[PDB]
Each structure stands twice: as structure tokens, then as C-alpha cells.
Amino acid sequence: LQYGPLAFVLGERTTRKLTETSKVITVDGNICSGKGRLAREIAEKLGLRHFPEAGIHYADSTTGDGKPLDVQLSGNCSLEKFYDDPKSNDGNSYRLQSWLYASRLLQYADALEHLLSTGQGVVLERSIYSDFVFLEAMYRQGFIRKQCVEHYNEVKKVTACEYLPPHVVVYVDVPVPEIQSRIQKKGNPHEMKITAAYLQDIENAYKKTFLPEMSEKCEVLQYSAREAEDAEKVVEDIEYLKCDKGPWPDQDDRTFHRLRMLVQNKLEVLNYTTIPVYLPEITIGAHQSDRVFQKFTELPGRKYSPGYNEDVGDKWIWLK
Amino acid sequence: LLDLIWLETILPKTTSFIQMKMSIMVSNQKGLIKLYFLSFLITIMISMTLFNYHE
Amino acid sequence: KFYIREPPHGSPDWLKVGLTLGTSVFLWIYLIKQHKEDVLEYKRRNGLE
Amino acid sequence: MLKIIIPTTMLLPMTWMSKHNMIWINATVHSLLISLISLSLLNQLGENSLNFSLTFFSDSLSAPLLVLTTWLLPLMLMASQSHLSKETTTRKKLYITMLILLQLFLIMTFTATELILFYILFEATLVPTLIIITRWGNQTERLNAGLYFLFYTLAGSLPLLVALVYIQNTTGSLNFLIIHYWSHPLSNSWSNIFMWLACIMAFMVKMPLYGLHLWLPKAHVEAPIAGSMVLAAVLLKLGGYGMMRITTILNPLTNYMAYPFLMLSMWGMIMTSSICLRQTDLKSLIAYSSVSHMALVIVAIMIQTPWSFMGATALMIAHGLTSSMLFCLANTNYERVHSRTMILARGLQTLLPLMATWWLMASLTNLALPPSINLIGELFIITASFSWSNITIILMGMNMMITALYSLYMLITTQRGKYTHHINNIKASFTRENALMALHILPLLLLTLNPKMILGPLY
Amino acid sequence: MMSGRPGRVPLQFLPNEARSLPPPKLTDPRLVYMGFLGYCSGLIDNAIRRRPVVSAGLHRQLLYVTSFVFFGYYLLKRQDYMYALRDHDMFAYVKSHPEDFPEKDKKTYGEILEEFHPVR
Amino acid sequence: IRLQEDPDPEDENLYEKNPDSHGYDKDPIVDLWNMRVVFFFGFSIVLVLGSTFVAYLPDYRMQEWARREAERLVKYREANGLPLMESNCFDPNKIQLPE
Amino acid sequence: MNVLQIVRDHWVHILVPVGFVFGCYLDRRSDEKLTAFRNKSLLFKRELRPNEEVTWK
Amino acid sequence: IRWTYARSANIYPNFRPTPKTSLLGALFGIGPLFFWYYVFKTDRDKKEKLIQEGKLDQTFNISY
Amino acid sequence: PFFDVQKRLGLDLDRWMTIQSAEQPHKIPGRCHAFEKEWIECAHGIGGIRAE
Amino acid sequence: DGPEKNYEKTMAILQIEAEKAELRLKELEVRRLMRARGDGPWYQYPTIDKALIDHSPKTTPDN
Amino acid sequence: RQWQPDVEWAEQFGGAVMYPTKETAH
Amino acid sequence: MNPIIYTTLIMTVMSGTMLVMISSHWLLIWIGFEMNLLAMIPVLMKNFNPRATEAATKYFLTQATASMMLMMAIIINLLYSGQWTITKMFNPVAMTMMTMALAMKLGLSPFHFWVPEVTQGISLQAGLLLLTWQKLAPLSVLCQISQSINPNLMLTMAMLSILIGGWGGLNQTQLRKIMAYSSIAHMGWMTAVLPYNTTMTILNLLIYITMTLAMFMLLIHSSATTTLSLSHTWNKMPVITSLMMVTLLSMGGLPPLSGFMPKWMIIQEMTKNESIIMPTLMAMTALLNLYFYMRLAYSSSLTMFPSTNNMKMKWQFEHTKQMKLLPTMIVLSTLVLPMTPALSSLN
Amino acid sequence: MPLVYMNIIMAFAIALAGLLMYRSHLMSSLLCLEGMMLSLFIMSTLIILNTHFTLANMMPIILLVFAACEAALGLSLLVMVSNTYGTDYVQNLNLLQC
Ligand SMILES: Nc1nc2c(ncn2[C@@H]2O[C@H](COP(=O)(O)OP(=O)(O)OP(=O)(O)O)[C@@H](O)[C@H]2O)c(=O)[nH]1
């Protein structure tokens, strides 16, 4: 039985399993700051599950086998246009951020379902309260006009108020001249095109709005790169923390019923990601949306609700 | 003049405008509770005595 | 197979469906028996036969 | 009539679960089969209407309209094949469902026994056409088109409902057979005038009548082609079938209050035909032509003469085949030129030989060459109107002359003259729309051989 | 027109008195139409639930039609019972009150003066 | 360009890739089959046999019976010195006139 | 020769013909419902011959 | 398209209730109907007044 | 009652206070006991239309 | 089929609808006078039941 | 392509009251 | 609100209404109204938005005033009759006081400026429960007391409801607001036939219950509250809005959809009572109701509206909620005309 | 129908009038709401005491039981409207005009 109001009436609670072991945490590091290494290192030793950074195609993993869908049918945008030419009228830049926003909604949403249905904490790579950092850095570098930006907070506030900040987070500190060397050292051709001021804008927003407003919702564990490669001290302090300050203790079972109810069904989770506000980077044409909505239909599995698509198996349909 | 100027002005557009014009005054209620219940009082009072629906 | 997570209706609920045919036949033979006994209740109430 | 009703509704499951490419073939072939079965309805006795069932009956008035609907249904099926190719299968089946549902309501309407049952399916045709006009239209205005067409018909429909239910409480029944057989004179009491009125404007708003016609130019010129034929060919005639029915009891009132509508109509077609002569859009002419042709029918019913009723029936069927042809003809040109401006594509005889013919007798049937049924209906109206009043002759005679004036005018301004050299997309005329016109025209001459089947029960 | 008639036991779907009436025939077109309502309801169910419409789970579909015919059956039995009651108080009250419904003699067409309005 | 919409596709002509087609649909084999079956059903027995059906219909409104019965009492009126047809459809004796 | 496709393609094609005969079945399921005056109209009051026992069916 | 749009759409948005327009609306409106109303009413009244006492030529007219 | 469950279920819920001549505690009669007793006994089963 | 099809069919249909027509008119007036007079099987508006009244001796003798 | 609602067509009734006036202007 | 308390809170509302429809004592009827009001105010402000507080508040003062007036009208009836039974009112002032006392609960005449924004402020869930269930109790009282009703007052109550309800809906965008005025429009239709045949308003109630139910849980599935927000559902859920067309047409009474059955059957009954001018009137003014239905129909899927690129992963996910009887409710809300004579089951 | 009936009936009218003329206070509005309850309770008490409707003497009690029940509801609603909007004048809750 899926957790509905019936289970709570039966007595199904999640505060019983909500303990010190249910820490939903994520390493909010800079670009190529080794945050993924630090996050996974926490995962193996603290016993927490790992959530890879929800990309443009993580939602494709949430629905079906997980193969990245086509760009036009899984975002209408892609990352190479962001890095190569971050200035055009099509606005691939914000279409990335708007789509990438909803990916971390799900990544945190599935993080909830893990530790409210089992009580087992998770690890991620950044989270919902990190996407504004990129978007703020997006505006200062002249990427997409502020009309998208001011709509972003309106959407952000109405898709995260019901959402409870994580238990702790980790901020890996890597100097920005070194990061520009690091992105140049990797060799990804799209990484060459990145402006150096973008990386420090990420670093600035990390220590200007995220870290200050995060301090009262989770513990500050700002660790330098010299403090990041060693995988122990970054997790002993987590155990030696308190998990006292924050809204977690004052969330009784009725909040958790409200929480898991909303996050069990994604439809109202991102119902406010599709605000009736028409924007150049978001308003698909009536004909274009119509065919594209059709285009989503011929894809296998994406014709009926899951468990009913006879094209990809699902035998005994005449009884299901 | 006859068809496209007068006929559609002698029946469709006039009636459409009449509904258009005074649908506003019905629906442009500021929401003050004092004003709403004041209208209740007048309706209550004129229900009898004046209109004598009790007689 | 495509949906890696077990779909909410991945397999039939043999309790749920088995009830559905189980009740449906009940719904029929009740109506069938009721239709007969009403006919027998007819022909003697008015003395038709 | 369930021998027609049952197969017609059986078209729905068949058209809704056919293959993604056979929907056009399947719907066309069995609709034609229904037409052949409906052809057996041409049989009529001396004066007894065929009383198949308690709730269904037909006579020499219902069947010609019945065959017209059933014969028509494959014609929009082939006409819509052109511009419905670029659509999904599910929506395409939805389009077919609307047409079949429209047909099914039409057959029940004509075969209805009492007035209230007739009224229910009569009006019920508004819904399928409302979706057809609005959902599948072409231009922004179609949204305003649907409301104009809906409210206009409804505004007159509701008074009839009040009068109809009032009939049941007074006479005791609404069955047409009893009403005519138990017919009683209607007094001239001031209430009875509105009683007479409430049973009239419902039928004449959708005729349409002069003044109360603006929905006609705002819908037919603007609906999808498939909806355009059924609107003009039959839907306007729904007022005709009702008016011959409702006039059986509304007497002798018709003597007085026919006047305010009579010369409203009598000045009407002459006025409307003048507008047809001076149009700018193609489909606007035929739409304005349809009300002009419909106007003489209004005089035919209202004058209450046996000759006019026969003329009303003949003009009713003849206009349906005609107006469908010209609307189909305009659709053929509009598709290639992506507009309906009259002088946009003048002089196309040099490139469209067979079309130029399909223009030729379609306009000639609009001119009503002898002995086409158009005149047989038209001339009967003239003799009836002249017997009513001699001074009538000048008016509609002048009208059918200004009717003649435009009815060659688009022929001159679409086929006669020189092609437009910048236009280079007039391809070879496809047999589909080509054969569509053949199926339109041959029944007209075939009925010309034996018109005796379409003068109604008064023949 | 009937809730105040004497002997009307409240909250009692079909009176024992009503069993003297013909039960609705199983083939009754009113009844079979209500079966179609169950069929239509089944198709609507699969449409919202994003299921293979016609060919989807028959058990969900077959329950709908089987339910509709049943509640259709007793509704049709109650249908004619009330109509029969309307036709029962019809004639008993007509017989009980004869004077307010007098018998009309015959005054055949050969004697009425009814006129002919000239339709010219 | 706020409304991201594909440009209006140019209308396709049925004869570009299928010159010998009949302008019914894209796939050829059913395009002939469509043409074969509408050209069959339309102008054939629905038209022809339909025309024979109406033309060779049984007595329509019984005008042959009218002529046959008319000739019978035309003789009868002419035989016993009677006008071909009287002025009263209903016998003026049975109608009881008021006053 | 591909027994599945031939029926599957044309199984919908018999729907109208069965409706027709079904349609022709029930409309004449109506005459026996409207028996009433058979050979009782004095215009067509025909004395029943011994060979048959009904005027029309 | 400018001609068609101005001849079809932009007449009402440019239309005005100007007394002149109402004047031509009146004489071409109820005017002609009242013209033909009186003409046909007068013709019918003048025609009808002789039918009821047999002063017309109708002997060879039994079709209508 | 709209849906008379008291009559069908055969129990009393408020048909003990609706009138003044019912079984009052310790048989304390009301002021107009006799006047209403005649009125109710007058129009019992006769119907509201005939009662008025 | 022969005209005796349509002739006798009309006889049945016309008669049946004739009875319905007269019954409909009869129902309109029967309900009309039954509602007004109230001396009929239906339209009997409820009144106070007479079994609720208590007849046992009360405190005061005169009641 | 048949005409379809555009952005400026969506906003015609996109206000708080889809028939505006001076009283509802604020 | 914890789930268990919510259920008992609802059961109290159903019990409060049930007490109204079974009790024969006027005090108990007043109690059933009081329990209904008391258990409902918490339901409206279930989510604790700022709007819901005054939405629930405007509910409270309106209905408390109605309840107090109802109590007063009961008291005068006791004073002049000495009876508590629901038979009729023996003081004309007592009756002429209850009509408005019950009207404000129903929201028919200018005692209606509470209905629109109380629907607007509160959630869609309680909006459905407000506009359908809360009307059985006051209408049940009206049906019982239908004998001694001033026809002049009661007819004017309904005529005003139809006019205002139709007129007000023309200038609404928020779907809840248009539903409230549309419900007010149906209020007059049910109450207009009340003096003549109480069987008819029960039929119209049952049809209106299915209309409002089926319409609302379609709105719940669409998760839309304004016309623009509904417009985008064509991109995601085409069948829901396509079904919404037929319900919208049925709600407007466009036949042969089931919504005609009340409008048709009602008109037949009043013409039996020589009422002709008034039945013609609501036939006319039901059209303005139809207007904003078609505008809703035009904006939903009759014309596909501009979409939002954030809808891709929206199409990737299906609804988890499980509206039941929705496939059933559409059937009764669309096609029951062939079973029209079934109104005699109510009779 | 002596003058005491006039006094409390006319009293209830001013309670009706007082409620239906909200000037600047929800709390004062609720006062008039409970004001109505006095006249109804007092008139009801006079009726069933004068008529010796002994079994109906419970009706004024049951009125009071459901009386304060509403009174509690009114103040509880008044708690939040004053808590989150500061005061209790019934004019600042017009956000539901649209
Ligand atoms: N617009 C946008 N881009 C995002 C978001 N989350 C991740 N990205 C992009 O994801 C890409 C990979 O992130 P990185 O931190 O560089 O990944 P990495 O190299 O694995 O990082 P390390 O583990 O620190 O080495 C970058 O292009 C990010 O900008 C998001 O919410 N919005």
C-alpha cells in the first residue's frame, strides 16, 4: 500500500524512524570542486544513499529505464549551448536552469521518499537551494534578462515553501583561479569557453546568499580543498555535530503526513513550475507544443500510464 | 449600412453590450462585509411592509 | 524491462480482480433469480396462470 | 427507420476502432451503403405517411430530406480528406464521429413523430456543428462565429419549447398525426399571436430570414468545408421541415402576421442578392446566395398553398445539392490559393478545364436553367405568389435577375480572363475533389428526369 | 403530483403491493440502455486512468455494466409502480367523483357549424 | 520570437512523389483502393441501380389507380345522364344544417 | 495465408451489415407490438380464407 | 488584404452612431419594408374586397 | 420529516415534545390541553388541505 | 408490402396516441381539483397524528 | 496551418476580471 | 489537519445535514443546521491560507445570521400555533421570515454576495463540498414547508438568482468564481419550481449535484484554478478538457445532454400552472450562463492555447490521486435523457 | 399578546439591525450576534412558561447549549483575523475581492 491518509489512520508514522541516521545531506561545492567525491565519500562511510546531481536527464531516470531522452522531448535545451555560446535569442541558458530546477525537485523528492518510508538518509550533489546560485551568476554575466530572473524567485518560493531544508550540507572551498585551471585541465571543450568571471560568480553567490541563509537551516561545514581530499574529518564533524538548530525537530507527524502526501504525487510538486507566465524561453508554440506532445507519445512506454504499455511488455493487460 | 452596420447593431451587439455594460456593476463588488450585510438589511426590510410579501 | 521501478499497476491484484468477477456473477444471478420469482409472483397475484 | 438508425450508429464503433489509414475508406463505403438503403424510403402511399413505429414516421416530405442527408454524408467525408491529412488518427476519428452523430440526429429529426421529440434532435444538431465550426475552423474569428451561430438559433429555440409544452397541456398531445387530425381553428386572441409567434421565429432564425441571418455569413464562410455543406445543404432546411409541420395548427392566424415577415422576406432576397453581387470573398457569395434562395422558400411555406409547398420542397432539395457544390467548388480554389478573395484567382479556365465545367452548370443550376428542379421549385412559388398577389411578380423576378447577374460574375471573375503569372501552385486537379463534383451534379439531372419524387406529400 | 398518500411506508424501495405488477422484461430497451451507460462509464474510466480504452482491463469494465443493469432493474420496477399508482388513483378518483367528469354525448360532424377559413 | 513555434509548413501536393495518384491520401496502394471503391460505389448501383429503383418503383401515390377508377365513374356519369362530378363532396342530405 | 490479418482487417467491415439485419429485425419486432386492428378496418375488412390465419406479418 | 480587411472587418470599429448614418439607416431600413407592406396590403385589401361577392375572374382556376 | 426514518425504524426521537398534549412529566397538563386535543383529533389523517 | 400494412399500423398508432392524449388532459384536471379540494388519495399534506395525545388523568381535573 | 490562439490572445482574459473597467482598473 | 479528525469533522457535517432531513421537530432542524455550520468552518480553512480565514469568516456571519433568523421565525410560529412539527407556518410573518432565513443558506437573492468569494478563498476540495452538500439541508426544509409558501416572494427569490448568477458569471476568470455564479444560476432554477412540484426540484438537485461534482473533480484532476491555468491542460491532459467540453455544454443545459432534463422538465411543469411569462424568462437568461461556459470551452481545448516548456516532465508523470465515480459521474451528467421518466422514482 | 412581547420582539429587530450594520468592529459585531440570542431565549422562556409546555422547557436550555457554541466559533475566527491582520475592524479582509 502506498502511503496515503489510510496508512496514517492505521498508525503508519515516520517520526519513529526519523533519527540521527536519517540525515539528508548534500555537498554544495563549486564547479569541479570535488564535491561529488566528497559526497560519495560521505555516502559509503555514513551509510547514506547517494543521489547523483540531477541533470537535464535525471527526470528520464525517474520515469522508466533511465536512458536520456531526446533534447527536444526532455527539456528542449542542452548544456553545450550554455557553455559554447551563452548569448542568443532562443534562450537555451534559462531553459536549462528552469528545467534543471525541476530535476533537483525530484532528486530531493526521491530523497524524502527514501527517509520517510525507510528512515535512511541520503547524499546528493547540491540541491534545490543551490540552483539560484547558478541563476544569480547567470544574470551578472549577461546571459538572460531579469524578467526570467524575477520569475524564478516567484516559482522558487511556491515550489519550496512546503519543502523542508536538509539536515546538513557541505561546502567544499576550492580557489577560483585553481578552478579555472581545473576546468582547463580536464579538457572538456565546452569547459574552455566558460568565462573566468562565471566561476567566481558561483563562488560569490555560494558565500553571499546560500551559505548565510543556509546557516540557520543546516550546519555550516565550509571545508577547503586542502580539507576536502581527506575523507574522514569531513564526516567525523558530521557525527560530532548536533542537528539541533533547524525546523526538523519541530516537524511532528502531521507535518510529515502533509510532507509525504505532497511529495508522493509529483503532479502538485511541480504544478507551480508551469506558471501561466509566457516567456521567450518557456512559451512553446501552440502548433509546436501540439506536435511535440504528440512526439512524446510514439516513444515506448510513454503512451499509457506505467504498467499498461503493451508495446514494452506489460502482459495480462486485459486484466490489469 | 443595412446588413453590416445596422442589423448586427439592432440585435446582437446591443444585447451583447447591455449584458457587457451591467455585468460589471454586478461583479465589481469591492468585498466590504459592511456593505454586503447592509444590502441584506435593505432586502430584509423591503421584503415585507414595503413590498408586503407577508401580506 | 522499461520501468525499472515496479509500476504502481505493474501486475494485476489477484485479490482485487478476483473479487471483481466474484461479485459480478453475484450481481447477475441475483437479478436472474429476482426476475423469475417476480414472474411467479406475477401470475398468482392477478391469477394470470 | 431503425433499419437506417441502427447501421448509422453502428458506424461509430467501426469508425472508432478501424486502422489508422482505413478510416476514410471504411466510412465512405458504408455511408454510401446507408444511402442505398435510405433510397428505399422514396416509396410513399397516396396520402398515408409511412408509420413504421410509434416514435417514427415518414412521408413524401421527410424521405427526400432523409436521402439528402444520407447521400450527403460521404460527400464531406471525401471533401474533408484533403485538409484533414495533417492530423492525428484519434482526432481524425473524432471528426468522423461528429459527422456521423450529425447524420444520426438528422435522420431522427425528420422521422420524429411528435414535435417535442422533433425539437430535441432538431436543436441537438447544434452541438456537433459547434465543435466542427470552432475546433476545426481556420481563422481567429471562428470563435466569434460559433457564438453567433449558437445563440441566434437558441434565442428562437427556447420560445418554441415553451409553446410546445403549452401545446401538450392544452390539446393533450404533441404528436403530429393527432395535431393535424385534431386540428382546431386558432383564435385571434392577443395571447394567440405570441402563441403563433413562439412557434415561428425558431424556424425562421435558422432559415435564415432577412434581418435574422447574420449568423449565416458569419458561419458558412468561416466553417470548415465539411461543416459548410451540411450547414447550407440541410441545416437551413430544418426550418422548412418544421414549418410545414407547425403550420398545420397555427391557422387561420397566418393570414395576418405573415405580412411582417413576408415583405421582410420579399424585400429580403432582392436585398441579399444585391449583396451577393458585390462581395469580395468567394464563400461569402454562396452564403449570401443561400439566404437569397432560402428567402423564396419562406414565402412558399407562409403563403400556405399546395403549389408553393411543392415549390418549397423542390427548391429545398435543389438548393442543398447546389449550395454544397459551390461551397465545395470554393474549397477547391481556396486550398490551392490559401485564400477566398474573388478576384485573387480570376481567369483559371485556361488551367482548369474540368473545374470550369464544374463552375458552369453549378452556377447554371444557381441560375436555374430549365428544366432543373431549381426552377420547378422556383416557378411553383411564382404561380402561388401571383395567385396571392399579382404585384409580387416584379420583385422576385427582379431578384432572380440579379441572382443571374452575380451567378455568372464569379464565373467571369474566377475562370474567364487571364491567369495570374506569379501563381504557380495550381497543380493537376485531383480526382478526389473532381469526382466529388460528379457525385454532386449527376443526382441533380437524374432527379430532373423524374422530379415527381421530391414535391412532398402534396403531389 | 405522491409522498402523502395513505399507506406509504417510508424508506421502502419496492412495496410488497407492487409485486402484482409485471416485472420489467430483461430485453427492455430502457434497461439495455442503462447497460450501455455502464459500458460508456468503463471507457471513460480507462481514458482518465491512461489505459488502453476499449481493450483495457475487462474486469473493471465488466463490473460497470453489471452494476448499472442491476440498479437499472429496480429503478425500472419502481418506474412502473409509481406510474401504476398514478393510474390507480386516476380511475378510483374518477369513479368516486363522477359528476365533475360528466359523460359527453355525441354531436357528430354533420351538425357542427364549424366554418372554413378561405386560404387564398 | 517569444512564442517558439515552427514555421508554417508549405502545403504538400499529392502528385509530387505520387504523380499517378488520385489525390486521396499518401500511401499509394490504398489510394487506388480508395479511388476504386468510391468510383465503384458512387456512380454504380447507388447511382444506376438507385435510379432504376426509383424509376421502377411500385405505384407512387396511386395515380394509375386514379386513372383506372376515374375512367370507371367517368363512364358511369356519362352513362346514366349524370354530370361528370357534383358540387358537393359530401351528400347535402346527411349534413344537419343549424336553424 | 495469414489468417490473422484478413479477419483483423475486415472484422470491422461486417459491423454495418449486421446492424442492418439487426435493424431490420427489430423494426419488424414492432408490428407484432402494434397488432391491434388486423383485418378490422372495414376498408380492408377481408374475410380470412381457410388456408391462412393472418392478414399480414 | 487591406481591401478585404477594410471591406469586411474595419467598418464596425470605424463605425459611428452619427445622425447621418442613422438617417440613411432609417430610410433604407424600415422604409422599404413599410413601402412594400403598404403596397401589398393595399393590393390584398383591394383584391380581397371583391372575392366575397363574386366580382373576380376565377372560373377557370381550380389550382393553387 | 423529509426522509421519515422515525416512522420506518419504529422508534421515537422527537415525537414526544412536538405537541402540548403528549405525555408530559408527571402528567402536568398544558394550558390549552383540551383545545389542542380536540384540534388534533379533529384533523387526523384528513390532510393539511382539508384541515385548514 | 400492401397498403393494409400502413393502414392498420396507423389505426393502432393513432388509437394508442388518442388514449394518451385524453388521459393527459384528464390528468391535468384531476390533479388540479385534487390539489384544491384535497379529498383525494394523493396531495394529502401531513398533519399531527392523534395517537401521540395522552388521555390519562392529569393533575388538575379541568383541562 | 489553421489559426491558433497566440500570446496576445491569451492575455485578453488574463486579468483579474476578464472584462475590465475604470473601477476594476486597480 | 490530522486525517482522523478530518473524517469525524466530515461525518459531523453529513450527520448535521442528515438530522435536517429526518427530524420532524423544528428545534432539531435548527440543531442540524447549527451542527452543519459548526463542523464546516474548520473544513474551509483546512490549509490555513490567509484567504481561507475570512473566506471561512464570511461563511460564519452569513449563516449564523441565517440560523438566528430561522430560529426567530420558528419562535413566532410556536407563539401563534404552539407546534414544533414541520407542516406549515400559521403566521405569514413567520413564513416571510424563513424564506430569507433559508435563502442566505442557499444564497439565491441579494443574500448571495457571500457565495462567490467564499468559493474563491477556500480550496477546491471544500469548494465542491460547499456547493453540493450544503444545499440538501436548506432545500429539504423548503420541500417540507412547500405548502405554506408565498408564491410571489419565492418566485422573485429565484428570478433574482437566475439574473444575477448569469450576469455575474460573464465577468469572471477565476474558475471558482464562475462556478459560484453558475451554481447561483442553478439555485433559481431549482427554487422556481418549488411551489408547484417538489418532485421537480429534487430532480434538478440530483442533476445539479452530478454537474457540480463532475465539473469540480475534473478541475481537481486538472489542478487548475484560473482560466489561463486550465488552458495549458490541453498540452498535458487532452481527454480531461475534452470531457470538460461536454460537461460544460451539459451544465449550460444544451441538450440532448443530461443538463437539459431539469430545464426541460421544469418548464413543462410550470406551464401546467399557467405560468408562461416567467418560464420564457429563465429560458432567455440561461444563455448568459451558456456564454462563459463556451468561453471556458473555447479556452480549454476547443482552441489549443500557448503551452509552457516546463510541461515535458509533466507529461512524464501521471496522476496518483484516484477520483472515483468520475467515469460514472460523467455518464449521469451527460447522457441520461432517454431515462427521463425515472423522475417518478422520486415522486 | 401584551407589551412584554413587543419589547423583546422589537429588541430582536435592533439586534438584527445592529448586526447588519457593521461599523468598525468584528468583536462588537459578535456582541450583536449574541444579543439576538437573549431575545430568542427570553421570548422562548416566556412562551413555554405561559403555556405550561413543561416538556418544552428544555428548549431554552438547548438554545443556550448551541448558543455559546457559536459564540466560541466567532471569537476563535476573530482570533486569527485579528492575529494576522492586527485589528478586528471588518474592512481589511477585502483581499477576496478578486
Ligand atoms: N543550470 C544548471 N546547471 C546545473 C545544475 N546542477 C548542475 N548543473 C550543471 O552540471 C554540470 C556539472 O557540474 P559540476 O559541478 O561541474 O560537476 P563535476 O565536474 O562532477 O563536479 P565535481 O564533483 O566537483 O568534480 C555543470 O555544467 C553545472 O552547471 C542546476 O541546477 N542548474
List SSEs of chain C in N-to-C order.
H
Strand content of chain C: under 5%
Largest sheet, strands/sense/barrel of chain E = none
Distance between the termini of chain E: 46 Å
Overall 3D shape of chain E: flat
Question: What general form of chain C does the structure show?
Answer: rod-shaped
Organism (chain F): Sus scrofa (Pig)
Subcellular location (chain F): Mitochondrion inner membrane
Protein name (chain F): NADH dehydrogenase [ubiquinone] 1 beta subcomplex subunit 11, mitochondrial
Membrane topology (chain F): Single-pass membrane protein
Write the layout of secondary structure elements.
The structure is cut from a larger assembly and holds 13 protein chains of 13 kinds.
Chain A: H1 5-10, E1 25-27, H2 35-46, E2 49-50, H3 58-62, H4 79-84, H5 92-117, E3 122-124, H6 131-140, H7 146-158, E4 168-170, E5 172-173, H8 176-186, H9 189-192, H10 196-214, E6 223-224, H11 233-239, H12 253-264, H13 266-269, H14 286-298
Parallel strand pairs in A: 1-3, 1-4, 2-3, 5-6
Chain F: H1 28-43, H2 48-55, H3 63-79
Chain K: H1 7-10
Guanosine-5'-triphosphate is lined by residues 29, 31-37, 53, 79, 96-97, 100, 104, 126, 131, 134 of chain A.
Describe the structure.
- The structure is cut from a larger assembly and holds 13 protein chains of 13 kinds.
- Chain D is mainly alpha-helical and 459 residues long.
- Chain D has helices at residues 2-16, 23-39, 62-79, 89-110, 115-124, 126-135, 142-171, 176-181, 190-198, 201-205, 215-219, 225-235, 238-246, 254-257, 259-277, 282-303, 306-337, 353-367, 373-388, 393-407, 409-414, 431-449.
- With 57 residues, chain G is mainly alpha-helical.
- In chain G, 37% of the residues lie in helices and 0% in strands.
- Chain G has helices spanning 3-10, 15-27.
- Chain L is built from 19 helices and no strands.
- Chain L is mainly alpha-helical and 347 residues long.
- In chain L, helix 2 (26-44) runs antiparallel to helix 3 (50-81) and helix 10 (198-222) packs antiparallel against helix 14.
- Chain L has helices spanning 3-22, 26-44, 50-81, 92-106, 115-121, 124-132, 136-144, 151-169, 175-192, 198-222, 227-231, 233-236, 238-251, 260-272, 277-285, 287-302, 312-315, 326-334, 343-346.
- In chain L, 72% of the residues lie in helices and 0% in strands.
- The chains are: A mainly alpha (320), B mainly alpha (55), C mainly alpha (49), D mainly alpha (459), E mainly alpha (120), F mainly alpha (99), G mainly alpha (57), H mainly alpha (64), I mainly alpha (52), J mainly alpha (63), K mainly alpha (26), L mainly alpha (347).
- Guanosine-5'-triphosphate is lined by residues 29, 31-37, 53, 79, 96-97, 100, 104, 126, 131, 134 of chain A.
